[PDB]
Amino acid sequence: MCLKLNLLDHVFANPFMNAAGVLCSTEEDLRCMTASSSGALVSKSCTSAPRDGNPEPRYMAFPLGSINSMGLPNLGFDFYLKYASDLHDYSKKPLFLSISGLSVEENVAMVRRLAPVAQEKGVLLELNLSCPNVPGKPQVAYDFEAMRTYLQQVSLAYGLPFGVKMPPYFDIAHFDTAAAVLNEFPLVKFVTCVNSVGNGLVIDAESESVVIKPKQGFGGLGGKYILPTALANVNAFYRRCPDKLVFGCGGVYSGEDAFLHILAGASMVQVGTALQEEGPGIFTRLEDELLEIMARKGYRTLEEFRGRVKTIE
Amino acid sequence: MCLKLNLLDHVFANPFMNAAGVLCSTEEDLRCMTASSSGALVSKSCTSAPRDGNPEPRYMAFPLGSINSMGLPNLGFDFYLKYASDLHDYSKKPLFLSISGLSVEENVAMVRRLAPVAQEKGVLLELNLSCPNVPGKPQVAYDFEAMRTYLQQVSLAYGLPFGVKMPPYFDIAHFDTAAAVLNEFPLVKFVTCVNSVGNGLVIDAESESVVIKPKQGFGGLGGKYILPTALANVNAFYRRCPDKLVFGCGGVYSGEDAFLHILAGASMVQVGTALQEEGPGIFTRLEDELLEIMARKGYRTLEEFRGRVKTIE
Ligand SMILES: Cc1cc2nc3c(=O)[nH]c(=O)nc-3n(C[C@H](O)[C@H](O)[C@H](O)COP(=O)(O)O)c2cc1C
Ligand SMILES: Cc1cc2nc3c(=O)[nH]c(=O)nc-3n(C[C@H](O)[C@H](O)[C@H](O)COP(=O)(O)O)c2cc1C
Ligand SMILES: Cc1ccc(CCc2c(C(=O)O)[nH]c(=O)[nH]c2=O)cc1
Ligand SMILES: Cc1ccc(CCc2c(C(=O)O)[nH]c(=O)[nH]c2=O)cc1
């Protein structure tokens, strides 16, 4: 039994990869993720220009998960593009490049440049629809007209299959609306659910203080707090986007957690907080654990159960 | 050292109360909450007509919290109004009555009738703005124009101080907008943050099945999953609504979790999942745990720390 799979015209040794932003920012990080047992990797979301990001401390983890307000620190698009074009060893595993411009125009400019590298090398695009707060307007994926604009413009400019990284939704009407938008774009071939649960607040009782510095301690939540949110969003989009793939992200610490993501509809399973905390060895454990649950159940392939979560009546 | 609060022209022995929907549906429930050491109680969110609610199973709990899609089962308004006007012993503690009409007109009809009982007996209204509204549209509090309509009409029809039960938000733009809507209504004297984290999905690995029957397993999340989200919302509203009280609700299992809520700005602190699981005994434990934290830190009253969460630099 091996967990090998094929999608988006690429072959993957297993469905696991990092979540964007974790262990993917520097050349060192990308080489480490490449040397790991993961089935693929994704680069840190990039802007046209390098960014320092927010002041530290900007990430903290606890037994139940993590909070971050990194501020999109990154080495800039030229760096990730050169990684994709010249440094990445595509014989080891596929590469996804995540883009998160501060405007539609910045995204268009990055994707025009990415396209010939995607054609030549097979790098895959994940377009990150979450961005820093701008007072007076919601994050793009929470503004459906802006989301439709971004996707129209990126689709025209890029002209090749790509995916989108989505924040979680919490309302069935929103799921219906969001999926309807994504279904207008045939080049959107995969949807990644979810980004961190926005603007949580962790407080330390002893010190009576928030635990990250930026945004008065408010940041996105990852980890065990978010698993049922992530599963709901994976399944909602899996149901609503039958001609697309869904990539699951959120709360994966174990092969069991991955199993639940795949039951819900996930093709690839991304690991964020648990990867940040445990390091890249986690990928061998997750593989072993997922194969062990499969063997106990008699499943030989992921296809056998992907999306097969049972409902009651 | 004491847990006493005075607010809304009422006196409370301590800040703890049940969350609406837990241990509050029947006369038996309400008498149980009254006999408990809670500082107050709130009645189950009601509609004009009694409702059976959704098919079972419709609530399930786990180590990290709960999921529910109860479907607003309740004994109807006339019952909760009679409890308030004739049966509740107000010398024991104060009562909140929660309403959750299915249209603005149904809420108006209920509040018009509640008003004389509120004035004469001192029952306090909590209007649930997670009331579903038109199917295919978002819940009312996620539709700011509907929220404004509901609050104009209830304000006119009731004419007395009341409070609102809010869903969590995840985007700073929504904190901004929601709080600005609330701040239009001077009779909204308290804001209860938060209702359940909407439309999560819990999946049982062994059975490969969702765990509740309604909504193909999707329901609202409560408990340990949602404490940082709850704390963020209490603090966001505390900071934005300086002329209103904030009540905290979400993830309280211990005196320490209550202490955090209060550092975030909570006046009263409600308890849902942990009360559902542990029963009314939890209130003595929470009181004891909170007084122990206060004594260690030399705090003699709640006011000494309410809203005093520190931020970094
Ligand atoms: C430190 C940190 C940096 C992150 N940066 C990004 C990013 O650059 N792009 C992105 O799409 N998501 C980013 N995320 C979100 C994750 O990819 C992921 O969606 C989220 O952490 C939830 O998954 P988890 O429960 O496995 O942590 C970041 C998360 C963390 C913790
Ligand atoms: C079984 C159940 C029923 C609920 N019914 C109501 C309701 O009728 N009205 C309401 O405002 N919130 C209701 N809620 C939400 C709770 O009041 C509370 O906001 C939510 O459970 C989060 O708090 P917790 O983490 O302590 O559970 C209900 C929650 C549960 C678990
Ligand atoms: C406040 C904020 C800043 C920047 C982003 C985009 C990058 C990003 C970040 C980040 O770099 O802060 N963290 C996440 O959890 N998800 C993300 O998508 C999202 C929100
Ligand atoms: C789908 C749906 C139906 C009815 C409501 C309002 C009552 C309510 C319920 C409920 O009765 O299902 N559960 C909660 O966690 N919070 C609530 O406010 C909320 C959602």
Side-chain angles (χ1 to χ4, degrees):
Chain A
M1 238 195 340
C2 52
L3 301 156
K4 268 176 90 264
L5 77 166
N6 203 100
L7 43 94
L8 305 165
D9 295 298
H10 290 262
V11 181
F12 301 80
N14 64 68
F16 295 106
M17 55 180 300
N18 65 304
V22 179
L23 198 60
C24 53
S25 295
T26 63
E27 180 168 349
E28 176 187 329
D29 290 343
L30 295 167
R31 284 185 193 272
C32 182
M33 273 301 299
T34 300
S36 88
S37 271
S38 72
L41 80 166
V42 53
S43 60
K44 173 62 190 170
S45 292
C46 68
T47 49
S48 288
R51 293 170 59 90
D52 294 344
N54 296 336
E56 294 192 329
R58 55 197 188 178
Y59 168 92
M60 289 291 289
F62 307 91
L64 298 180
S66 74
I67 186 166
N68 87 80
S69 288
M70 310 295 290
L72 195 55
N74 73 97
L75 292 180
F77 176 77
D78 290 356
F79 171 82
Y80 302 102
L81 188 71
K82 167 191 290 102
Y83 185 81
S85 192
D86 299 351
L87 312 176
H88 192 250
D89 184 352
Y90 293 84
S91 70
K92 301 286 170 159
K93 66 191 60 178
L95 171 69
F96 294 86
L97 197 155
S98 179
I99 296 319
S100 190
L102 297 188
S103 69
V104 65
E105 292 86 4
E106 192 190 347
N107 283 323
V108 164
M110 287 197 276
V111 303
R112 295 194 186 286
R113 296 175 60 199
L114 179 62
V117 182
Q119 288 266 38
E120 166 102 327
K121 303 287 176 157
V123 61
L124 298 149
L125 170 66
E126 187 181 87
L127 173 65
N128 179 4
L129 301 182
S130 311
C131 35
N133 180 54
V134 181
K137 49 230 246 25
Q139 224 87 316
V140 164
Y142 289 166
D143 178 353
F144 297 119
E145 199 39 70
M147 175 176 149
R148 181 184 282 102
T149 299
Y150 269 52
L151 294 180
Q152 293 173 333
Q153 289 289 115
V154 168
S155 294
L156 198 78
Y158 192 57
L160 301 160
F162 67 102
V164 182
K165 180 73 171 293
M166 310 290 292
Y169 302 93
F170 300 92
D171 184 283
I172 298 304
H174 287 167
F175 294 144
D176 296 334
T177 304
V181 174
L182 296 183
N183 281 333
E184 297 173 29
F185 304 94
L187 295 171
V188 172
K189 301 288 196 225
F190 68 95
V191 182
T192 302
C193 294
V194 294
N195 211 315
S196 55
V197 168
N199 297 288
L201 185 65
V202 173
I203 305 172
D204 181 69
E206 189 283 315
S207 66
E208 310 179 16
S209 175
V210 304
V211 308
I212 57 163
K213 173 166 176 178
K215 291 175 62 169
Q216 297 179 115
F218 281 73
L221 303 171
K224 301 189 195 287
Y225 289 118
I226 84 166
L227 178 62
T229 292
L231 296 175
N233 273 262
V234 166
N235 192 59
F237 288 92
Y238 176 75
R239 293 176 179 276
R240 287 167 174 71
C241 301
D243 294 337
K244 294 191 199 309
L245 300 176
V246 182
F247 288 3
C249 190
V252 173
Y253 290 70
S254 77
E256 193 161 295
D257 304 331
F259 179 77
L260 295 180
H261 264 274
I262 300 167
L263 276 179
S267 281
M268 296 294 291
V269 179
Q270 309 189 338
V271 190
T273 308
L275 170 58
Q276 180 55 217
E277 296 310 297
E278 176 166 332
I282 193 166
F283 291 106
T284 56
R285 182 175 62 76
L286 291 178
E287 288 148 34
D288 289 342
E289 291 179 352
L290 174 57
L291 285 163
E292 176 64 356
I293 290 155
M294 286 168 64
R296 163 169 94 244
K297 287 163 176 291
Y299 286 133
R300 291 182 293 151
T301 67
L302 306 168
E303 186 277 346
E304 262 158 12
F305 66 101
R306 175 181 303 115
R308 308 299 208 145
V309 58
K310 293 168 185 191
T311 59
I312 303 171
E313 280 62 286
Chain B
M1 201 152 69
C2 85
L3 302 185
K4 187 157 151 176
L5 322 82
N6 278 224
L7 49 85
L8 290 172
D9 201 38
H10 295 250
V11 185
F12 302 80
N14 65 67
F16 299 110
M17 56 185 297
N18 68 301
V22 179
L23 198 52
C24 57
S25 297
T26 63
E27 192 172 331
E28 178 189 326
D29 292 346
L30 296 162
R31 289 188 188 284
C32 183
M33 276 299 303
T34 300
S36 82
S37 77
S38 71
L41 81 166
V42 54
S43 61
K44 174 64 194 182
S45 289
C46 65
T47 46
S48 279
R51 288 172 63 86
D52 286 346
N54 286 333
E56 284 173 344
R58 56 192 186 179
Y59 170 84
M60 288 292 313
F62 300 96
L64 295 182
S66 70
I67 191 169
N68 89 78
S69 287
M70 305 296 291
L72 250 181
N74 72 98
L75 297 181
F77 176 73
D78 283 345
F79 170 83
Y80 298 108
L81 188 61
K82 182 181 287 76
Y83 178 81
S85 63
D86 296 348
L87 307 173
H88 189 246
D89 186 355
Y90 293 85
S91 74
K92 302 290 183 177
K93 57 193 72 173
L95 177 69
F96 296 83
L97 199 151
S98 170
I99 78 167
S100 177
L102 303 188
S103 63
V104 66
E105 299 67 24
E106 192 187 351
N107 282 316
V108 170
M110 295 193 270
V111 307
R112 284 197 251 103
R113 310 171 52 228
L114 181 54
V117 181
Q119 211 170 302
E120 160 61 8
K121 300 281 192 268
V123 66
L124 291 159
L125 168 69
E126 182 179 265
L127 168 67
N128 180 9
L129 292 178
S130 296
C131 42
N133 180 43
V134 169
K137 302 201 86 203
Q139 65 159 288
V140 173
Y142 283 178
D143 176 346
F144 295 122
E145 189 43 68
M147 195 172 97
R148 184 181 283 105
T149 299
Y150 274 52
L151 299 170
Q152 280 161 176
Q153 299 248 256
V154 173
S155 287
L156 194 58
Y158 197 51
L160 301 162
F162 64 107
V164 296
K165 173 81 161 280
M166 312 289 288
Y169 305 95
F170 301 94
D171 192 307
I172 297 311
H174 298 167
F175 294 153
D176 289 347
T177 304
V181 177
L182 297 182
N183 279 336
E184 296 177 17
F185 299 95
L187 295 173
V188 176
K189 305 301 193 201
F190 70 95
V191 181
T192 301
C193 290
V194 292
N195 213 312
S196 54
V197 165
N199 293 295
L201 185 63
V202 172
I203 302 173
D204 173 65
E206 184 301 309
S207 68
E208 307 173 21
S209 170
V210 309
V211 304
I212 59 166
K213 170 159 172 179
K215 292 182 54 172
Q216 294 184 119
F218 282 73
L221 302 168
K224 312 208 183 249
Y225 296 113
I226 76 159
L227 170 65
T229 292
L231 293 176
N233 277 257
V234 163
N235 195 60
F237 284 89
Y238 180 71
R239 292 181 185 275
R240 282 160 182 75
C241 299
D243 297 315
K244 303 181 192 304
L245 302 165
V246 185
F247 292 3
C249 184
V252 172
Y253 288 75
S254 67
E256 192 151 297
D257 300 332
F259 181 70
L260 306 180
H261 265 270
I262 298 162
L263 291 170
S267 288
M268 296 306 288
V269 173
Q270 314 189 328
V271 190
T273 300
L275 172 56
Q276 184 60 213
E277 294 311 299
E278 183 165 335
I282 189 162
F283 293 111
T284 56
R285 180 172 58 79
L286 292 177
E287 292 153 22
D288 289 345
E289 287 176 355
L290 178 54
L291 287 162
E292 188 73 324
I293 290 158
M294 289 171 64
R296 174 200 313 146
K297 293 171 169 285
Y299 288 133
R300 298 185 293 175
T301 67
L302 298 173
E303 313 85 71
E304 279 185 79
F305 65 97
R306 178 183 300 123
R308 305 297 192 93
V309 55
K310 301 172 180 169
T311 58
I312 303 180
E313 314 186 78

